[PDB]
């Protein structure tokens, strides 16, 4: 588990903007899945998490 | 079959078809239904 304060599996500092790119492309397309999910019903579910 | 037209009228009007939820159109539709030779499928399987 990602024990917070223990110096190797703590939380990933240092990200730039690929990465979050990245996040963003995928998981407009994994979440969508083939029309399973609303855009809008991603959207608020990705504000509330 | 009155409510019906009521419906497709509330879909036409306000459904926003975008991107992500499209329908197959109509002509597509009824062109599949009938190169299946539906109607006659349906005939053979109700008199036999
Ligand atoms: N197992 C599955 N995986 C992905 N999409 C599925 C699915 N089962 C049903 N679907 C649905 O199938 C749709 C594809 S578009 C639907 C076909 C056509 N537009 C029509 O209206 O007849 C998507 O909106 C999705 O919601």
Same mark, same amino acid.
């Given at each position: 588990?990602?024990?917070?304060? !223990?110096?190797? &599996?703590?939380?990933?500092?240092?990200?730039?903007?690929?990465?979050?790119? $990245?996040? $963003?492309?995928?998981? !407009?397309?994994?979440?969508? $899945?083939?029309?399973?999910?609303?855009?809008?019903?991603?959207? &608020?579910?990705?504000?509330?998490? | *079959?009155?409510? #019906?037209?009521?419906?497709?009228?509330?879909?036409? *009007? #306000?459904? /926003?078809? =975008?991107? #992500?939820?499209?329908? =197959?159109? =109509?002509?597509?539709?009824?062109?599949?239904?009938?190169?299946?030779?539906? *109607? /006659?499928?349906?005939? *053979?399987?109700? %008199? %036999?």
């Amino acid at each position: 588990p990602l024990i917070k304060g !223990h110096e190797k &599996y703590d939380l990933r500092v240092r990200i730039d903007r690929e990465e979050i790119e $990245g996040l $963003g492309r995928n998981l !407009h397309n994994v979440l969508w $899945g083939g029309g399973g999910t609303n855009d809008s019903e991603i959207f &608020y579910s990705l504000v509330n998490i | *079959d009155i409510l #019906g037209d009521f419906f497709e009228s509330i879909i036409r *009007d #306000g459904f /926003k078809q =975008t991107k #992500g939820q499209f329908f =197959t159109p =109509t002509p597509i539709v009824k062109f599949i239904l009938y190169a299946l030779q539906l *109607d /006659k499928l349906a005939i *053979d399987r109700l %008199n %036999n």
